[PDB]
Design a protein around this ligand. Sequence first.
Ligand SMILES: [Mn+2]
Ligand SMILES: [Mn+2]
Ligand SMILES: [Mn+2]
Ligand SMILES: [Mn+2]
Lengths: 384, 384, 384, 384
Amino acid sequence: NTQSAFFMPSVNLFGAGSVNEVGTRLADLGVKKALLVTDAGLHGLGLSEKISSIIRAAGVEVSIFPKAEPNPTDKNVAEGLEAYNAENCDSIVTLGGGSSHDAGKAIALVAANGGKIHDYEGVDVSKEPMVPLIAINTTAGTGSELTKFTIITDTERKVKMAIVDKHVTPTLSINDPELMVGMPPSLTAATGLDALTHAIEAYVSTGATPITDALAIQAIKIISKYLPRAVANGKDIEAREQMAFAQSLAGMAFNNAGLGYVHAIAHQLGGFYNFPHGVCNAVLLPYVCRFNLISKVERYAEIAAFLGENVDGLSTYDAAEKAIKAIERMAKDLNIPKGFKELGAKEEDIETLAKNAMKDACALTNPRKPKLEEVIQIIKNAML
Amino acid sequence: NTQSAFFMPSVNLFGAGSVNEVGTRLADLGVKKALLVTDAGLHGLGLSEKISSIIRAAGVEVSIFPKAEPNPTDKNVAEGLEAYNAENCDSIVTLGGGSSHDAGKAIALVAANGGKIHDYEGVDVSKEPMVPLIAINTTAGTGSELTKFTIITDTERKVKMAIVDKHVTPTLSINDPELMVGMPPSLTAATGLDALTHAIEAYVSTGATPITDALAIQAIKIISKYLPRAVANGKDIEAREQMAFAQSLAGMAFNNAGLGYVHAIAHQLGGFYNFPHGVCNAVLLPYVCRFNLISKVERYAEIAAFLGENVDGLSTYDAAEKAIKAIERMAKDLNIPKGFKELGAKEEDIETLAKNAMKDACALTNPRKPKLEEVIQIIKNAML
Amino acid sequence: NTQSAFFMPSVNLFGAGSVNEVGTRLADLGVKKALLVTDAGLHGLGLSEKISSIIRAAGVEVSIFPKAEPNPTDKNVAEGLEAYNAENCDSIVTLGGGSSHDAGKAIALVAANGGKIHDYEGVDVSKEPMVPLIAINTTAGTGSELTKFTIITDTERKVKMAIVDKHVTPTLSINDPELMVGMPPSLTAATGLDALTHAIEAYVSTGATPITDALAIQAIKIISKYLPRAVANGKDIEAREQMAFAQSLAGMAFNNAGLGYVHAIAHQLGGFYNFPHGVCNAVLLPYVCRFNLISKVERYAEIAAFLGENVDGLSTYDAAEKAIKAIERMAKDLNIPKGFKELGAKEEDIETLAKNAMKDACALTNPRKPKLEEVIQIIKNAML
Amino acid sequence: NTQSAFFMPSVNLFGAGSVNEVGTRLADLGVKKALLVTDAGLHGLGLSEKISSIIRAAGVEVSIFPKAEPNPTDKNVAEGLEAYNAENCDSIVTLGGGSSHDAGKAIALVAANGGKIHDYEGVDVSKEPMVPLIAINTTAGTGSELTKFTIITDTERKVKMAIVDKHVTPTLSINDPELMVGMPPSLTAATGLDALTHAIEAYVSTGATPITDALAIQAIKIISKYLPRAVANGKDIEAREQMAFAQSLAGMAFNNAGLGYVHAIAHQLGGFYNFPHGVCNAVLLPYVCRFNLISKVERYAEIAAFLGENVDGLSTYDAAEKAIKAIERMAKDLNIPKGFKELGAKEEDIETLAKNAMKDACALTNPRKPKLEEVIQIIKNAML
Ligand SMILES: [Mn+2]
Ligand SMILES: [Mn+2]
Ligand SMILES: [Mn+2]
Ligand SMILES: [Mn+2]
């Protein structure tokens, strides 16, 4: 069949100052105590309490759980659900980047489902919707405040599992760019390139629809113009607002179109070496795009135009290639590592990495279907 | 502030066969009796009964209210509220075009807030969200299955009131293009041109965002290619699916960006003479675009490109004029009336219509802020 | 259904002198006596006997039936079968233009199925293949030596009936350009413009496939270059051979894609007034193309390029309009009447003409689905 | 003489599900027992049994001969005749690729003339038509379901003989794209490049006609767009259906125009080393095309445009070179070896290969007539 679906929270707030409403919104849902899931860094800056004050000034109680780690783990979820039950909480508020969002979603799902986080790895394997959750986003990538995806790291196999379930769509989302001014340049670049990867993989995905196409095209155009600006000056409010829009666009697109082998392989490099997710995506993107080129050459030529390249007088092929080179130039200008060999990756794991990549759910929508040998080749290419 | 928000149902189903999920979805909400709101035509074709079977086969009871009329009225809403209450319905399922969705939305709102429908004319006037509602769309225009708009006619003032309230966002939406194959050509043309008006007014609205821009641009390009094909052959399945996507994209765009003076004046022409909504929009669109040109000339030039026009070597002003000419050519090719006078309009009402048009909420987002005399002149030009 | 089928005689002979094989090929079929179906003009010019000689010099007997009339009638078929069964024939050889092919196909079908020619009006009505038949073509039009169409006129209804049956695809086809050198200019023009109508209607038909498209594009390009040369000088052997190829390409294309409302209306103007089939097609072609424009604007723009027009810097719409202008110009240069009233048509019959046109099988594949009102408007536009 | 001919089965089915008709069609011919000729791979996967079931469910008997080998051999044909007679079969159904079609055609031809397969090598060597045959195609290249070619391998001379005889045109053809989804990527690439070789060699062949040109041009354009898509994802239904159309187009074209020295040399390399047919064609095509440039430079420039290359501002010569470069890049993107020595070819054979190649029937229509030495240089260049 030709059936498809579009998922997103019913209410999504944007713009400078939107965070000052989390508490009132939390009160309208009729919940009483929220577990504030954040990371140690944002808690170690006072943002946790700024938000907690906003919620308490509306009559809702807060218990701060600042233990979500970059690449959140199953242990983070177990500790967070134990805190959730020990503190008699009925809601969850996530504050931070994708790690906080995914930790809160996992806690919220298991808190309504019982089980363990690992049992719901795959697509729509869970049975109940999660507890009320409001997601407040402070990074310009991921889009997890809008998605039905939670990426939990399995510590025994060292694999960043993709739990794709409609029951983890947040109740309400908040995208306040004033909370993103503090992202240091490396973080700005990595999150922005994770959003660009989302838009590109959604555009070439086999589950793409005219709606997701609209959103992904706009995301590529905005990132192409504003991401380098946000890396060059993080106090540039226009660039921050445009990247907040681009991040939400890319999230809406990939959430409903699917991803591809960039994320399938990046999840394995991040589960093995705890590298930053966006850095992994930025290193892999050119190689997977070249691998996919013959399957979606017309769409890569369109991406070349979306990224500002002049494609006048060129075959679809020469334009498709200009797209990969513009992506490489951007990664180089945002001071992205040239390879995984320098970052700490080991040749002995390549084969394992590739096999786990062919089991990731993100691989199902890649436009080109490889054999194990070709995944090994992509991973080998990202080593230099 | 620079704050904005994006509203939408959390789950939106697309594709051939989507209606086959309605019953299960109703059961997931935990509802027990739904009032199925439709019109006399679709009930006479048996669609009401086909959907009723799907709903009852999942353990939910159905009572059919097939009395929503083109341009639903406050009396339709009162009768619907009585049927809803006499039969103890706790949910609503709308089946049809914009008239059925709005009748159901109005019934659900009044059933959850009290009073009468007239009490909520304006913006965010209600206090409680509306009863559970699933919207099944069968026309390729309006978008109402996704919006927070319900247009109900006040019969005494002869005014189609626009209730723009966050509390009438449907719970779930279903867009089955197989239910749209049966639209006769004039309805296909009128609904399609209403969707085109939605995308254009959203693109030039003062409340536009990068997100709404993405959606409206895609909608214009798709309508430009496929609406004439669906009008020429209603069994062109590709054109029908593309039109379903375009109508949803335009709905998403205008729901969150706003409309303009095309809709503000059309609501009055429809409240006075009961003309079909899309025909009023098609007649008025070139005149309001011309009136608005000086405020958004760059975006009208972009619309000219989206509509297939060649704008090489032209000033932005000349390209915006090519956009108006292409809109007029589409209206002529889809057998849209030349003016309003042949349909029954009376010059002795222009002033009343104009005064009411300045009270519509859609006028609040029009890019050019007019004076009574200018609204009058617009209606007068749309007379011949 | 994404299913389609391509039908054609298994052996098709081309080139100067190919007719000199008719006898031998008939002997390979193991046939013994054949009815030579032709028209009065070629029989009075002596071609019937010449061809009969080649047939007899190979051991097959021949009895000539030379009374098929331009716009063949049911009476022609009656007499034909009469002769076929009186003269004890086991095969049929058609010699001439579309009238001889259609007469022979009808006779061969009734000789194997037994009814009345009227009984098989429509699509695939018969149950038995027709008697062995070799078609020798002498006009650069129709294509019937390879098609499954036979158009016989119903003298009573005054309707050119369309019998579309897979069982009348001829056994063997012969395209000898040496027999067409004698076509006077008006016949050359009318048959060539009937071939152009075949190619255009095949290219825009709803039953087009990549194969029929391939054939139709070539037919348009060759007709565009060589038909005016063949009308200007019937002894231009190059033009005659290229026109023979183009007529066969267009026949293969329309045989397997379908025709449209040009033919649906032309069959009615021809059954009422005995006008030349190709002249009717040439008068009607621009009006039906304009009516169809909104359904196939992209393909009409391509036709404009195939007809030699420059479409650089034009919208698809303007390029399609240039295609219609090029068609009008060619018809004007080949001295085609601008309209029908000057030829003897009467306004009082349009309505009848329109109703009968909507019953022709050629109307089923027209890209735009019309209403009676619109068919009347087309015929009225084609009267002046 | 300027004479030519077009040959093809009278009925050719396309589209998903066409195979469900085979049984009905077998009954219409009046056949009692059919030999199902296939290979061990298709028999071991169970497809043979599906088709045998459709045929027997229509009252025709089936005996499966699953012993046709890639590069069918005279021993397979002799054994197939042994099975055919030792089971009193009166018809043949071929299911699979070119090897199955050619094996079945050869068995049926020897079954009707009594000779041996080696005796009919050449052009139009047989005296009787072959037994009734329906060809079910599962590969996207050969075209044998429509051709009068059977390529059977002579185990002693180590040469693939080409039997081009009017009597092996199948009775009916079925091209079901659903049966091609299982083609692995390398097989998809090799068969598709054999179809491309057919179309190119037909376009530049000395036996080209305007009809073969039309078909070949369309085939090249479709292959250029869809072959890399079918190789990148065999489950892409659109790509598979377009490739089925392109393979049929290329078969129709080469069947009636001729091939050239690509096939002449590849037949010898496949008879000597059991290489895949399509890989030999893909490796040799650029070298024979360069050799041919001076004879058909205008048609190679046109092929450059058909393959998507931009030729603006170039001499005809540079455009023809862009065509050779485009063929090489396509072969590289589909992982085609650049040379033959890494596959096992030996130099002491070059001369024998060349000698045998000037002896193949496909060499008569090549546009440039070479000398032994030039063929030797072609094979030597195809080694690196
Ligand atoms: Mn990501
Ligand atoms: Mn509207
Ligand atoms: Mn005709
Ligand atoms: Mn071949």
